[PDB]
UniProtKB/Swiss-Prot annotation, chain A:
Coiled coil: none annotated. It is found in: Virion. This is Minor capsid protein P11. Interacts with the major capsid protein. It comes from the Viruses. The hydrophobic region might anchor the protein in the underlying inner membrane. Induction: Expressed in the late phase of the viral replicative cycle. It comes from Paramecium bursaria Chlorella virus 1. The lineage of its organism: Viruses, Varidnaviria, Bamfordvirae, Nucleocytoviricota, Megaviricetes. The gene is A352L.
From Swiss-Prot, chain B:
It comes from the Viruses. Signal peptide: none annotated. Induction: Expressed in the early-late phase of the viral replicative cycle. One of the minor capsid proteins that constitute a network internal to the major capsid proteins and outside the lipid membrane. The minor capsid proteins glue and stabilize the capsomers. Also acts as a molecular tape measure protein that determines the size of the viral capsid. The hydrophobic region might anchor the protein in the underlying inner membrane. Interacts with the major capsid protein. This is Minor capsid protein P2. It comes from Paramecium bursaria Chlorella virus 1 (PBCV-1). The chain holds residues 193 to 240 of 576 of the full protein. Transmembrane segments: none annotated.
Swiss-Prot record, chain C:
Keywords: Capsid protein, Late protein, Virion. This is Minor capsid protein P8. Induction: Expressed in the late phase of the viral replicative cycle. One of the minor capsid proteins that constitute a network internal to the major capsid proteins and outside the lipid membrane. The minor capsid proteins glue and stabilize the capsomers. It comes from the Viruses. One of its GO terms (cellular component) is viral capsid. Interacts with the major capsid protein. It is found in: Virion.
Swiss-Prot record, chain E:
Belongs to the NCLDV major capsid protein family. Keywords: Capsid protein, Glycoprotein, Late protein, Lipid-binding, Virion. The keyword Cell inner membrane does not apply. Induction: Expressed in the late phase of the viral replicative cycle. The viral capsid possesses up to five major capsid protein variants. They behave as asymmetric capsid components. It is found in: Virion. Major capsid protein self-assembles to form an icosahedral capsid with a pseudo T=169 symmetry, about 190 nm in diameter, and consisting of 1680 major capsid proteins trimers. The capsid consists in 5040 copies of the major capsid protein (hexamers), 60 copies of the penton protein (pentamers) and 1800 minor capsid proteins of different types. The minor capsid proteins form a hexagonal network below the outer capsid shell, stabilizing the capsid by binding neighboring capsomers together. It comes from Paramecium bursaria Chlorella virus 1 (PBCV-1). Myristoylated at the C-terminus. Glycosylated; highly branched oligosaccharides. The pattern of glycosylation sites are unusual. It comes from the Viruses. The keyword Glycoprotein applies. This is Major capsid protein. Its main location: virion. The chain holds residues 50 to 292 of 437 of the full protein. GO terms for molecular function: lipid binding; structural molecule activity.
Length: 37, 48, 54, 437, 243, 516, 517
């Protein structure tokens, strides 16, 4: 699994580093693209 | 071979030799570009 | 993603042990094949003479 | 009022027993037969509407039963790779006048393009100048040795011909700066030369890819580059009374671009056999003069080059002439006409030298003679394409030559013909061998 | 960092919500009292803000000046002046740390705090353009000030740390923030020279519900000069005397 | 004999080249396309279109796919504009159209000819050559028709001063007022492309010139140059006029992946809710002119016009597709392969005596998608400044003259001597000299090698965009990237620009568009 | 570290580039082809091959396909020919091969040198530089050899008048006589290509010039100008003579689709009943030359030869196929997608100062087959005339230097100010300035920008035939088409030559070929 070390949520530069010293709960994601709802 | 000396006409198939004389009839209008920006605002009354 | 690594990995390993075990590929004349000339400068040797049959 | 020609309904072509294929399928399978003349969108010049809907029977070959669009383009996904640049070192001190051998370190999974780098030490002679094109003038011979066998060999003249014949125009000015061609280099300054090596590698040669599968060369089977450099006495011109300071060591290295592959191909190239189509060269010259037993020398009115040592399928040949004594660049046209024989049979009607110089090259690149006097003859529709477009196989022939008709000369010129031929190199079971010799 | 250059920041995600942003400059002035006029925000030529590469707004130094002129009052505008200029008749050589608060949609009140917790795909990035022509620091009018030093710049962001309940809600629930934008392009005046009242009709190009329109007539040479110069005290250099 | 003999002979190698044939070279093959037609249709502007403005243009859905876009710019001729400081020589004056005290006979201009006078016709103002068609100052006259001609009037609206001696005095300006060679590119500092409000790409004045010098084809550069300028420095810095100091129509292409690749023409037929816009950043009129005098007013003689642009009209080349293509485009979701441009700036000093720096510099590279290449250019003189005198020649990627050192050094090339790219703290490759990046990399990868020193490095096997991926480096997985520059010792105090064209995917669905 | 960090962390976005790979860039491949060989075979002409003649060539069925064809033309050097009215100074007189009064010692020409004379050698005629290899007139003498060399003699056959005094008169003729720059193209007014008497295509000298400028690449056009004698006006109009006024062998290509596209090579093996024939139209004797005097005829100094063409040969490159393909070529019918030219001539007054014109001019077009592009060529000047004085320079589609107006106007360019095409009475596109069609259109679509006033307009998307169509306008169904040209006001009257390359289908079967409409 060498290609998977340092991976972000999608191809963006998030400064991955966990700046928030805490839990970071999960954001629900409905796969609705052009117009969210 | 057979030479197909095809002529004037518009919107027709390859089997058609010609349909037009000097001015082919059919044409279509555009859809009026950027129309969505234009709203035709209705009027209102002033109480008066 | 796992099978994409495992499948060529297995193929790669099987070929590895094939070569890691014996010298070269085990191929003989197939591997140790010198180039062919295949020109006709001397395909017909002009035997110097033809003796008579006796 | 009379019935218009063809009828009140526009006249039509009949469907007979001679009409076939597209002239019928185009009408029955016409994809746009269904819309009620509403095919086009709005906002247009009327003439564009007319063009878009004015197809005839002659168009059944172009716009009926479409196969592709010009705009629904697809790209192919490719195996992940990355390129790292490594600098290879010579095993010993690099010197002029000897063969400097560089061993490759097998750093990556494939070898791509290669470039040789050298500086010219500042000899310190204010009146001294170097050779016209040090980028090539120093390289007597360059060979790539792959195990025990040689894949290709090139020398000073071929390299310059290649550039003057297959270097596309937008690159020449930059290349001239790169190899310090058409410039004067003085001996007061230390100059940095960077010289591309036109191997069977990917680019620089109108080629495509042809990567070296370095991983599958086993153990003590490695890649060596043989750089045969001329001695300085032939390279640097000094004024009378100036003594050559000499060079005891040269700062030189080889730049090799190594490609690392995704694991899938990484092992395949290391393990599985691969065969590559390669281009090999040969050099056959003929003197413009002949000598006899008493040692007398006479000029030849008619001089021919015997291509008897060449036994390979040839794509094209390249012809130059130059002064016997001035073994340097800048070629001369001394040929009035030339013709080609196979086993004493004419191959084509004798053509003037201007044909070979100005016309024949149309097939390929650099059909011009601004300063060049390089002429060619092809056996293929194009020379540059990787694809083996065509060739003449010399293997079964016993008496091949180009006969060049010249005016009597006062300068002992030599006419030198190069051939570029196809071969194959196989990388299998740790060994590298050619298919044909 | 430097005069005329462009730098950017990416707001780190150490919290749940962010609200104010304060840009700091440390400047040294090249002239005596009265030479400068809002150098901290002349310098901050503009700030663009985007989320995930999506432009949200952009503010310009002239907007900062126009906004201040319109919307900040008697106590807060003097304090603003204290943060952006020298107000105590300071002399050449004075060095001061300046604070230029930004005026984006989320930083004038907590009610519109920007939810970084809910942006695991997008970064919030700010582009800062620094002016090359800063009155009293690099130039006096059009004349360069020899020896002028580069600024020291830093950008501070105020982060909000929420409890476990609200942190979960902001991360899990969708949000619709009702935000403000600025719309701006440059244009020319038609000021008459003599014996006439010229006029112009300039086409507006705006496209969202608009709270207000505002404008000024600027001398491009002198930042914030929206009126004519005159030999009236405070209305031109040397006003009231022979100079 | 001839070819017939060649066909009869047989070699073993033939079994690998002509045995069991797969293709032939003498049987023409082709594919079929849905009928389409092209039309170049004018777009409108929202906002003012002149120097220093930021107009926006919305590209309307005139066709199904929006292809190439050209901007038509009609600039005035500056040979008639004054420079108020008037350092010398009285600016400019029209000779032929005004000042009717001057008489024109045989195209020769004379002062107040009196028809009743003696054979001494008059004082000569300018002579005209009926074979060269040029005007000459201070021609030799021993007779009415001038004889020997010299001092060519390279600038026709010259100055005349009167009431000095017995006759007025005429002289040719010595200050050549002209447009920056690359005027069609210099005018626009940048153009942004957005769809639905999301920025897709952005070009800069410098990039167009860099891309032209880097990826242009032979025998079109003279055409391209004519359309936007770019007079080669060898003649531009020779002081030419008339051809370099005139207005007229310039044609600026927008070289986006969506403009020069049919497969990426913007599918507006499938974008009913999102329009795309071009956001312009245009220069101030007190720019793009490399004048001999400081330039301050640069304003017309005839009234007071501040060198306004006369016209600006852009055209989008639309394709109109037939019914089956338009139906599939609106119903089927698409993912298009697109290129974005990003760049980074830095400002070295290259040790000017004083302890302000050294020749060892690093630039942090904050790029965000797979990158094709890194392109490095160096702008240092007054050619990054706003001054006209030795300034504003932004397309000047070389070392300036600076004879203010014991050696009166000037120019020389080799802006950078060695560079190495550092990825996450480690070298990606071993260091190579500037010559490698200036000449070898474009010799291998690109269609041309640049004249102006431009340093490139590619992550591709070969590349000029080429309408297909061929290798990239994904900078989203590089947490810290720095490019280390080893600089020369005779550089000025200016800026370095680094450009990085990169990949993304444009998703089209349900009338809306946007990037991943 | 290294490229491994790049290789390994290819990242999420790159999945679209490297996921589920479809091709490899690292495996060189080629396809096996059909054995063939090429032979260059000379064809002969039927009819006199000289000025004003119309010879034909029948291409003999030597091979299976007829490939590229080149015309090899042998022209005399014309400086050996006199201008019959003798405008001035005896245009030419050979001074080396004839007239034994000329003496030659150290390559220096002297008048009647007497070996028994004094140190004053004789009267110098021409000095020779042993380093430059040039002759010089009026050199300074004193020692036996001349000491200072100037007044370079470019045309060797100068004009001499003898026995009038103590020295003969030596003058360099003030008459720079030369072939027009474009002799390679100008010699041939037109050429027809037909199968079985039925014409397929016809090319003109104007098209070959335009097409080469429009569709040729660097380092081929430079050779094109050398073998197809042409010169850039930048040097031709500088007064060059001996460097250009030469005869010898010229090589003119015939750039037909049947000659340029290997796949469209004429399959003569499949055409047993129709022979391919070329019909030539060679220019006239008093044409294709330029001079600074009114030339009415050019004749040899030796004899009365009226500057005839020395020879002319046609070389065709034939393709010979192996048996498998040769059999298929005969037995299987073929349908080729080919191109042909169409044109119409028109000679409007063209907005002259003269009151017989207007700047709003329309030209009605008469094209039918699906057109790939329109090309407009402008010929309105004294260079449209057959005169030798400024005339015959037909390949110069610019505004002439005609100072016959209040301003002494010359050159300038921008022949047309706006161009619009109208189909069926309605615009095909909004009108654009002329520069759009001189610079933008050819830059975007074509291989080369002529950078000479050439106007083009494409109906195809980014091609130059490109061996595959990329769009066309079908004129066969158009009711009427007009080209609207907004003219400049500094134009002379003359021709507007409009070409419209188009597509058609060539059907070959049962040994017969023909064009299908």
């Amino acid at each position: 699994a060498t290609q998977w070390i340092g991976v972000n949520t999608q191809g963006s530069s998030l400064k991955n580093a966990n700046y928030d010293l805490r839990a970071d709960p999960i954001i629900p994601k409905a796969d609705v693209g052009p117009w969210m709802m | 071979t057979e030479q197909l000396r095809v002529g004037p006409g518009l919107g027709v198939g390859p089997e058609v030799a010609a349909t037009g004389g000097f001015h082919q009839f059919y044409r279509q209008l555009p859809l009026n570009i950027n129309e969505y920006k234009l709203t035709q605002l209705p009027g209102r009354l002033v109480p008066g | 993603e796992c099978l994409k690594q495992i499948l060529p990995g297995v193929r790669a390993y099987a070929l590895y042990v094939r070569d890691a075990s014996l010298p070269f590929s085990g191929g003989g004349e197939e591997a140790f094949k010198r180039p062919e000339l295949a020109t006709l400068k001397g395909s017909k040797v002009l035997s110097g003479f033809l003796p008579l049959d006796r | 009022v009379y019935t218009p020609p063809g009828g009140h309904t526009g006249g039509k072509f009949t469907q007979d027993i001679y009409t076939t294929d597209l002239l019928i399928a185009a009408k029955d399978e016409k994809a746009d037969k269904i819309p009620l003349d509403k095919r086009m969108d709005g906002t247009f010049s009327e003439g564009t509407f007319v063009q878009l809907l004015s197809r005839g029977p002659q168009d059944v070959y172009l716009t009926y039963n479409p196969q592709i669009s010009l705009f629904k383009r697809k790209y192919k996904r490719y195996t992940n790779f990355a390129i790292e640049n490594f600098e290879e070192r010579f095993s010993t001190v690099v010197k002029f006048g000897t063969r400097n051998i560089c061993q490759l370190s097998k750093n990556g999974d494939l070898i791509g393009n290669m470039c040789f780098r050298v500086t010219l030490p500042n000899l310190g002679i204010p009146g001294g100048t170097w050779a016209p094109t040090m980028g090539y003038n120093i390289f007597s011979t360059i060979r790539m040795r792959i195990g025990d066998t040689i894949v290709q060999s090139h020398d000073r003249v071929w390299y310059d011909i290649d550039d003057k014949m297959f270097c596309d125009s937008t690159k020449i000015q930059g290349l001239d700066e790169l190899i310090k061609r058409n410039v004067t280099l003085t001996t007061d300054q230390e100059w940095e030369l960077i010289i591309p090596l036109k191997f069977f590698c990917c680019k620089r040669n109108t080629g495509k890819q042809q990567f070296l599968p370095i991983l599958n060369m086993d153990t003590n089977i490695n890649v060596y580059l043989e750089f045969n450099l001329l001695p300085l006495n032939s390279l640097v011109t000094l004024p009378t009374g100036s003594i050559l300071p000499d060079i005891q060591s040269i700062d030189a290295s080889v730049w090799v671009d190594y490609i690392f592959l995704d694991d899938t191909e990484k092992f395949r190239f290391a393990q599985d056999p691969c065969v590559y189509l390669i281009e090999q060269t040969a050099s056959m010259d003929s003197l413009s003069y002949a000598t006899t037993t008493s040692g007398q020398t006479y000029n030849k009115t008619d001089v021919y080059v015997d291509m008897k040592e060449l036994n390979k399928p040839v794509k094209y040949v390249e012809i130059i002439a130059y002064e016997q004594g001035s073994t340097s660049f800048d070629y001369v046209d001394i040929i009035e006409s030339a013709t080609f024989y196979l086993n004493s049979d004419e191959q084509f009607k004798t053509r003037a030298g201007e044909y070979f110089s100005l016309v024949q090259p149309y097939q390929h690149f650099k059909r011009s003679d601004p300063t060049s006097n390089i002429s060619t003859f092809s056996f293929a529709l194009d020379a540059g394409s990787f694809q083996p477009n065509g060739y003449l196989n010399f293997a079964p022939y016993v008496r091949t030559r180009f006969a060049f008709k010249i005016q009597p000369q006062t300068t002992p010129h030599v006419i030198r013909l190069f051939a570029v031929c196809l071969n194959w190199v196989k990388f299998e079971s740790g060994l590298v061998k050619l298919l044909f010799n | 960092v430097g005069f005329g250059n462009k730098v950017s920041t990416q707001i780190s995600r150490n919290g749940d919500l962010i609200t104010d942003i304060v840009v700091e400059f440390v400047l040294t002035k090249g002239g005596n009292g009265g030479t400068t006029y809002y150098p901290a925000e002349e310098l901050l030529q503009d700030v663009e803000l985007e989320i995930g590469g999506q432009r949200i707004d952009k503010h310009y130094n002239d907007w900062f000046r126009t906004y201040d002129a319109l919307f900040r009052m008697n106590d807060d505008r003097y304090n603003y002046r204290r943060m952006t200029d020298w107000v105590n008749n300071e002399l050449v050589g004075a060095q001061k740390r300046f604070y230029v608060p930004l005026i984006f949609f989320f930083n004038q009140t907590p009610g519109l705090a920007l939810p970084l917790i809910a942006l695991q795909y997008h970064e919030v990035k700010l582009y800062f353009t620094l002016a090359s022509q800063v009155q009293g620091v690099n130039y006096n009018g059009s004349s360069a000030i020899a020896g002028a030093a580069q600024p020291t710049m830093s950008v501070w962001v105020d982060y909000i740390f929420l409890d476990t309940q609200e942190r979960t809600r902001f991360a899990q629930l969708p949000h619709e923030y009702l935000i403000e934008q600025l719309q701006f392009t440059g244009s020319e005046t038609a000021t008459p020279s003599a014996t006439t009242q010229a006029s112009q009709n300039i086409r507006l190009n705006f496209n969202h519900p608009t709270k207000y329109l505002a404008w000024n007539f600027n001398n491009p040479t002198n930042y914030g000069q929206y009126t004519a110069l005159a030999n009236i005290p405070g209305a031109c250099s040397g006003a009231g005397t022979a100079a | 004999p001839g070819a017939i003999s060649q066909l009869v002979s047989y070699g073993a190698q033939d079994v690998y080249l002509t045995g069991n044939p797969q293709i032939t070279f003498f049987k023409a093959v082709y594919r079929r396309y849905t009928n389409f037609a092209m039309e170049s249709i004018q777009q409108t502007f929202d906002g003012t279109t002149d120097f220093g403005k930021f107009p926006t243009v919305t590209i309307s859905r005139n066709g199904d796919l929006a292809g190439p876009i050209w901007i038509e710019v009609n600039l005035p001729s500056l040979l008639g504009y004054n420079i108020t400081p008037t350092p010398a020589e009285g600016n400019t004056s029209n000779i032929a159209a005004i000042s009717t005290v001057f008489k024109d006979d045989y195209n020769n201009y004379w002062w107040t000819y009196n028809p009743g006078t003696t054979p001494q016709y008059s004082n000569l103002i300018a002579a005209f050559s009926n074979v060269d068609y040029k005007y000459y100052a201070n021609a030799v006259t021993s007779t009415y028709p001038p004889t020997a001609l010299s001092n060519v009037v390279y600038s026709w609206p010259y100055m005349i001063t009167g009431n000095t001696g017995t006759r007025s005095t005429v002289a040719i300006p010595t200050a050549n007022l002209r447009y920056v060679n690359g005027i069609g590119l210099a005018l626009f500092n940048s153009i942004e492309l957005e769809l639905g409000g999301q920025r897709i790409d952005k070009h800069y004045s410098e990039w167009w010139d860099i891309w032209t010098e880097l990826t242009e084809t032979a025998e079109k550069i003279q055409g391209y140059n004519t359309m936007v300028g770019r007079y080669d420095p060898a003649v531009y810095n020779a002081g030419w006029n008339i051809s370099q100091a005139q207005g007229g129509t310039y044609y600026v292409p927008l070289k986006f992946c969506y403009n020069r690749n049919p497969g990426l023409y913007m599918p507006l037929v499938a974008l009913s809710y999102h329009q795309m816009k071009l956001n312009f950043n245009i220069n101030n009129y007190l720019n793009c002119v490399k004048c001999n005098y400081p330039v301050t007013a640069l304003t017309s003689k005839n009234g007071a016009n501040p060198l306004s642009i006369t016209n600006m009209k852009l055209y989008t080349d639309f394709v109109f597709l037939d019914a089956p293509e338009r139906i599939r485009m609106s119903e089927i979701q698409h993912e298009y392969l697109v290129t974005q441009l990003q760049w980074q700036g830095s400002e070295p000093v290259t040790a000017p005596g004083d302890p302000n720096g050294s020749t060892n510099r690093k630039i942090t590279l904050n790029f965000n998608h797979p990158v094709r290449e890194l392109v490095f250019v160096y702008q240092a003189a007054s050619n990054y400044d706003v001054d006209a005198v030795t300034g504003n020649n932004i397309f000047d990627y070389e070392i300036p003259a600076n004879p203010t050192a014991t050696p009166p050094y000037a120019g020389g090339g080799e802006v950078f001597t060695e560079v190495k790219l550092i990825i996450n703290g480690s070298d990606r490759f071993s260091g190579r000299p500037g010559a490698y990046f200036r000449l070898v990399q474009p010799y291998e990868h690109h269609v041309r090698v640049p004249s102006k020193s431009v340093y490139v490095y590619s992550f591709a096997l070969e590349d000029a965009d080429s309408r297909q991926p061929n290798g990239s480096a994904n900078f989203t997985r590089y947490d810290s990237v720095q490019l280390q520059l080893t600089l020369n010792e005779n550089l000025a105090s200016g800026r370095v620009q680094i450009y990085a064209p990169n990949f993304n995917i444009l998703r089209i669905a349900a009338g809306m568009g946007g990037l991943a």
